[PDB]
Design a protein around this ligand. Structure first.
Ligand code: PLP
Ligand code: PLP
Lengths: 455, 454
């Protein structure tokens, strides 16, 4: 089909996630047709650099014919069987075993889902069930943060701190609370980032004491906030969050849906920041987005509590789906065996971070240049010296993002933050290629900003 | 790996849906390895008849090499791309256009998810967003039924009426209410099925008036309740439910996750019972379980309402997944082009129903022998005359289902209901082959009752 016709059929029959349906159907959808390595092509024939790896998830990049073969082979033998009827199958068994190999010690039990959002809902139910098993029925509140993102189920949307999501669904559901996010640029006042990390972590302590520790089940956080704009907390933050959770007997949960499977150069974001969660949620990079699968990695304390609780009345038809498991297995084994994660840690991550900071250092309206491993970002700001953001946060970021897309580069705006998370397998030449397009785009952005008299 | 090898790793590493992990680990998990047609082979080389089609979902049967090729092909060109970025891709656009021709009139727009549960969650947010768009911020309560099943998200479980689920996660969440299920055998008193259907339906009107109609956003129901035990509502039930919903400006939603894609003989469960829902949820048969994919089909009125509301701040990374959509597309085309649904209505459904009753009616403790299309059930009872159920609904079903298990037959126990939902492509010879193992299991079962002091 042509561009115009695929656009016509999409506008007529498709409801997109997180989209203005009326305005999209007017402008027309951009039709992505094929991918190879770090590159995409659209229906018009534009070669595009995918500086977002699909949706933070295509970690091995596009073009894995071995993954298609793994999919074909498994679908031919057993395309589906359920894990509900005192039943299992070799693909789910073999994946579970492999995951145990690459996860830290103590994470041997895994619960499968189809998505990061289902993993979060599963985790919420696990956390609350755990406290019931302990005879503490009031210990049910989960604390997340403003501008955190934990998916799109009613449960995950409530635990998330996106107001725009809360306003649709009568959210949050009860037993949720939120603390401010560890965003130093906005909230740091005259503290050092490290002083600020302690302050921002102790917001959890003061929330717990406001609520009553006996009512708090868990604190949940993305090691680095992804959708909120790659907010990288100070080094002092996570160890203090962990101290506080242990002080008050509150479960500690990492949402690893973005940071997992090598994004920071460790296998998991929590390893980078050096905390030890009781559970963590995954998806995305688990299969590099090649098939839908998510998981909850359940540490020993909680797993023992759940196993002591008899039946766990939860799950999805497609939990442990054999074909998705086969592809995840192929993916995880590749991340290990081809040295992809190790390469982020030791080679391409430090290169990207260095180049990133070199690239964006000069611009008058770029600040808070940050990142680690293969996730990185900056913020477009009104005045650097005053740490002053643009009003209507998001307007300026959108203008910038539009310059990127027109220049065949995918980087995302989260408010006025610009973020990137390319395939981990990106080469040095491809990093420089990407950064070259980005830099030219920021030159144009700075020129347009002065021209608008938005100076 | 051997049986014991697989079992040991499963106990060590895998937490299963809807399971007592301690006791599954102690017993050892049954390891399913391969499937063909309507049969499975396990780690021990038994030939097992799959009268549950995976999990009500393997509708075109096992062994569809053409599906594996569609998957392979799509995975090689573009294994993934997001639909969040003012972006789309051929496979999702193509599936969307195909669905609109097999779904009833006025269902042009689909929202993709990965699962039935996520579909239910999406439907809940849609219902509530819709009423906000309509300037009715109080119109937010969804009504389900006791023993209805709407998945396993916190939302779906709340809308669901399984007490055993509500007990885990602090459910239901707010703006959820529940009415009694149209289960004649227990609630029929002295009414005829058709009379009770009117009464069981009016329970909805009662609940609405109690809550207040201005607070009520939707009534949601599976056309035939599945996981609750294939409860088939009287013919009078759904039309009254629809009148009531229309009387009080309450949205009618069908959960078609089980009944969808040919299961009763129509494409959808609601078509069989002749109501017109404003939205309906789907998964399972959409891809015949070959790849995870679900959907919410939005009727014209609601679609109009959601579009007027600008941004819909909802969705999943793998929404519209290219590879799942290609496989869904190949499955839907197959169900239609290969005439598998049509055959359920005309050919195999009637046969299955007649023969089912013929096989099971004659038993002492088998009553309420029911079913339509390729979904069918019966209930294990203490006394047929008294409509007396066994004490502690569930004990007897297990005892019985465990006989099936060691006779290489899969039919599921829902309380003391026995249910079956085999692939739609099952042949008459297969139908007869399955019932014969069942009859013998039953003959065994009834005898084991007496020899126990019953
Ligand atoms: C994207 C995301 C999720 C939800 O995952 P889905 O697969 O889209 O349901 C949850 N947590 C985090 C941190 C995410 O980035
Ligand atoms: C199985 C089921 C669901 C949930 O679908 P999953 O894909 O398992 O999340 C929802 N509604 C009904 C009627 C179902 O049978």
């Amino acid at each position: 089909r042509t561009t115009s016709q695929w656009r016509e059929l999409d506008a007529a029959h498709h409801l997109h996630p997180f989209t203005d349906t009326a305005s999209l159907n007017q402008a027309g959808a951009r039709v992505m047709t094929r991918g190879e390595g770090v590159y995409l092509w659209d229906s018009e024939g534009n070669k595009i650099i995918d500086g977002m790896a699909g949706l933070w998830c295509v970690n091995v990049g596009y073009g894995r014919k071995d993954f298609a073969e793994a999919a074909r082979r498994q679908m031919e033998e057993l395309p589906f069987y359920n894990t509900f009827f005192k039943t299992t199958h070799p693909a789910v068994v073999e994946l579970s075993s492999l995951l145990a190999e690459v996860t830290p010690a103590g994470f041997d039990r895994v619960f499968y889902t189809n998505s990061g959002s289902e993993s979060v809902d599963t985790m919420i139910r696990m956390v609350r069930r755990y406290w019931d098993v302990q005879g503490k029925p009031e210990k049910k509140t989960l604390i997340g943060r403003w501008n955190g993102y934990h998916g799109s189920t009613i449960g995950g949307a409530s635990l998330g701190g996106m107001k725009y999501m809360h306003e649709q669904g009568d959210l949050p559901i009860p037993g949720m609370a939120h603390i401010e996010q560890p965003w130093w640029y906005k909230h740091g006042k005259d503290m050092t980032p490290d002083e600020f990390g302690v302050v921002a972590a102790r917001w959890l302590e003061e929330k717990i004491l406001e609520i009553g520790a006996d009512k708090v089940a868990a604190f949940v956080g993305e090691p680095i906030q992804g959708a909120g704009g790659v907010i990288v907390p100070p080094a002092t933050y996570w160890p203090e969050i962990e101290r506080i959770c242990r002080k008050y007997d509150v479960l500690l949960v990492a949402d690893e849906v973005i940071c997992g499977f090598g994004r920071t150069g460790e296998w998991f974001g929590h390893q980078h920041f050096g905390f030890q969660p009781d559970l963590f949620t995954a998806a995305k990079g688990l299969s590099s987005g090649y098939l839908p699968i998510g998981a909850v990695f359940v540490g020993k304390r909680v797993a023992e509590g759940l196993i002591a609780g008899g039946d766990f009345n939860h799950g999805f038809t497609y939990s442990g789906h054999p074909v998705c498991a086969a592809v995840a297995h192929a993916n995880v084994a590749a991340l290990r065996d081809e040295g992809i994660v190790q390469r982020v840690k030791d080679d391409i991550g430090p290169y990207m971070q260095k180049r990133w900071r070199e690239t964006f250092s000069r611009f008058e309206h770029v600040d808070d240049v940050r990142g680690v491993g293969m996730v990185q970002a900056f913020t477009l700001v009104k005045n650097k010296a005053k740490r002053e953001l643009f009003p209507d946060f998001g307007e300026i970021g959108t203008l910038c993002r539009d310059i990127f897309f027109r220049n065949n580069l995918i980087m995302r705006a989260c408010g006025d933050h610009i973020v990137s998370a390319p395939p981990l397998v990106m080469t040095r030449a491809e990093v420089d290629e990407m950064l070259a397009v980005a830099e030219r785009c920021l030159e144009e952005f700075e020129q347009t900003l002065k021209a608008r008299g938005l100076a």
